[model samples]
Target: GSSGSSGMGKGDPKKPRGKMSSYAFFVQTCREEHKKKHPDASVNFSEFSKKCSERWKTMSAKEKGKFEDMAKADKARYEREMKTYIPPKGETKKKFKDPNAPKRPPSAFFLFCSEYRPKIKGEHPGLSIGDVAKKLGEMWNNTAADDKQPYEKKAAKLKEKYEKDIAAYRAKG
Candidate 1:
């Protein structure tokens, strides 16, 4: 698995896919000769590319042997580098999260109950948090689905505003 988002998870791409294959090098040489022959008006890129493709298709195994040898040598070099490769010591499975990210807003249900929790003890003088909490749970279960609709609505709008402001704040200098 890769440890970084940057190019070259373990090794540089320049030594791998980034480097041109021997066939591409051959095409480059032919393209130069083509340019020399028709300096004033050369074929379009697509036409030139088509010509190279056509040339490659008709090439014999003997003709392709040189490029194939170069390609094989390059692959061998890449494998040689891979043998002694050691991952960075500081590589971690997880990236560090942003420390300054906005704190998650209280869920609509939680915000709806904050103003009610404190009054529980005042309304029922003898009840402990456990007993009060049990009664609150019963109250929630017994109440209509939208009994405290406005509280959630108020919080929802406030959360939307809160999120919007934070999003712009996050783009700060």
Candidate 2:
């Protein structure tokens, strides 16, 4: 059900950014025509998608040249962007962690778990730590956003504190 080349079904990382393929570029032109013809009604995405593929398959070289030209230009633009694009902060492709650095403050979900763990154990004394941890995760995931805001605020304050502490720690050495 994903829309693009780098697309993952639903809840997937979009780290695979790249230039649009020639076929994908053609799809945009087809979609524009479909929208112009049916401006009052919502487009059936899958139906138009199939039509685009069919049209792409049958188009003569002259008809296909239009998208090919656009695709070439887009590919060059993609290459140029790659030359200068810095990864957004807090994101890295590498899995390596700095052993010298202090750990980050817990997320709101984890912070909620820390406080909830004791209460959960009190109500369900027989449950193992693993079971309690799982249950706590479910509870946190299902928690209302308003109810979760306090823990998030708390965690954000702690994160800022940790940042300041790390800066001081680094400067001292």
Which regions of candidate 2 are displaced past 4 Å?
A: 1-98, 168-173
Report lDDT (Cα) of residue 151, candidate 2. Answer: 89
Tens-place lDDT per residue, model 2, 1-173, is 23344311344233335667678878877788767877897778888888888889899998888878988897676657545655455645554556677666788898888899988888998998889999987898889999888989888888997898689668875
The whole-model C-alpha lDDT of candidate 1 against the native structure comes to: 0.65
- For each candidate in turn, give its C-alpha RMSD to the true structure in angstroms: 17.7, 12.4
* Per-model TM values vs. the true structure: 0.33, 0.44
> Model 1: per-residue lDDT, tens digit, 14-89?
3332334667766776788877888887478888788888887688988888877876676566556545666455
TM-score of decoy 1: 0.33
Question: What is candidate 2's CA lDDT for residue 8?
Answer: 19
Of the candidates shown, which would achieve the greatest lDDT relative to the real structure? Answer: 2
**CA shift at 166, candidate 1, in angstroms?**
62
- How many steric overlaps does candidate 2 have? 0
